[PDB]
Design a protein around this ligand. Structure first.
Ligand SMILES: CC(=O)NCc1cn[nH]c1
Length: 119
């Protein structure tokens, strides 16, 4: 029933993601000195520290908005990878599976709480 519960649930899931070794390439913005052509390929950079800061600033209205930015981290990795067998891209796929497994109930609970509110 709780329309606000998603926020702390997302904070806890972000804490788990930061503990995951697979998140290391995605914890901070991609370094443009390390990858000079990054912005030629990627229009909208995204990373987990930016997601956490947006959440903590009260700049997400719903977990769907947070989920769209997290999914953008993964699609950027897929777009930038020179190979589907690359190390960083392979880490992104495992991390994506972990994220999707955990975000599912957060989204379902939120949508059901909002439907109850508007009943
Ligand atoms: C496949 C890919 O995303 N390469 C760029 C990168 C390097 N560290 N984090 C991202």
């Amino acid at each position: 029933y709780d329309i606000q519960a998603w926020k702390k649930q997302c904070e806890e899931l972000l804490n788990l993601i930061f503990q995951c070794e697979d998140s290391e390439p995605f914890r901070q913005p991609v370094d443009l000195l390390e990858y000079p052509d990054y912005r030629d390929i990627i229009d909208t950079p995204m990373d987990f520290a930016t997601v956490r800061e947006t959440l903590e600033a009260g700049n997400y209205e719903s977990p769907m908005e947070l989920c769209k930015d997290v999914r953008l981290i993964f699609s950027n990795s897929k777009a930038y990878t020179p190979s589907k067998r690359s190390r960083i891209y392979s880490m992104s796929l495992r991390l994506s599976a972990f994220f999707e497994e955990h975000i599912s109930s957060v989204l379902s609970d939120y949508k059901s709480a909002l439907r109850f509110h508007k009943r």
